[PDB]
Design a protein around this nucleic acid. Structure first.
Ligand SMILES: [Zn+2]
Ligand SMILES: [Zn+2]
Lengths: 122, 123
DNA sequence: ATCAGTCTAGACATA
DNA sequence: GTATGTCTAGACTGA
């Protein structure tokens, strides 16, 4: 991405979904800042994709959903759309990697939203 | 006044407050249908100001506030703004009538929202 | 501090 | 039917 192009893109407006994504990430960071080293870890997974990373997790809701700026979704599905598959459609398209200790189906107190602890399939 | 004048007014758009009030009324009416005859009573009070009326009440929140369509206010003040003094500013301007058994300050289970169970005072 | 505002988990309701 | 949305009391975050 080009210097002149980058500048013009600075003024570009975002689709409602791009703006909603900003809130969803902004919400997640708020959660992670409280825990020690969660941010650095989440940053690790996204920056170095090949190298394995430990889970980054948020508390699970009773039905498992998360609400961000009036919209309800599943945590792994939401954050996987942001960083890996923008067209991801449902939790059925996702399955966990064995590395993950807190997958969505886990039904544990916590749910991992590390996008690289899940694998997209049909 | 003229019937045409009313019809032209029917097409009037309403400011955000006028629309918010409609939502606030819808919220209460949704609550009151659950209770027996409360609707019939609330109309009695609004229809006959002279004739005294029994309390009409809604559940009390912990901080006492009520939220409607993202806006928080006190229940007696909200509904008093709708039907008696639209310029009411805070609960300091309101005091309860002796008739009311569920006034705002009472810290009871239910809160009377009957506008004719309160009196306005300059403060 | 009372006061006011924002955010969302849970409850409820419709599709 | 479960999936998807609506609404707000409570939590929380600042004067
Ligand atoms: Zn994980
Ligand atoms: Zn009363």
């Amino acid at each position: 991405t080009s210097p002149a192009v980058k500048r013009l893109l600075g003024w570009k407006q975002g689709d409602e979904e791009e703006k909603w994504a900003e809130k969803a990430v902004d919400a997640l960071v708020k959660k992670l800042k409280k825990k020690k080293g969660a941010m650095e870890e989440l940053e690790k997974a996204l920056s170095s994709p090949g190298q394995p990373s430990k889970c980054v997790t948020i508390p699970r809701s009773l039905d498992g959903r998360l609400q961000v700026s009036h919209r309800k979704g599943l945590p792994h599905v939401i954050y996987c759309r942001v960083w890996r598959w923008p067209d991801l459609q449902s939790h059925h398209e996702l399955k966990p990697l064995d590395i993950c200790e807190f997958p969505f189906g886990s039904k544990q107190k916590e749910v991992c939203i590390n996008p690289y602890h899940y694998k997209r399939v049909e």
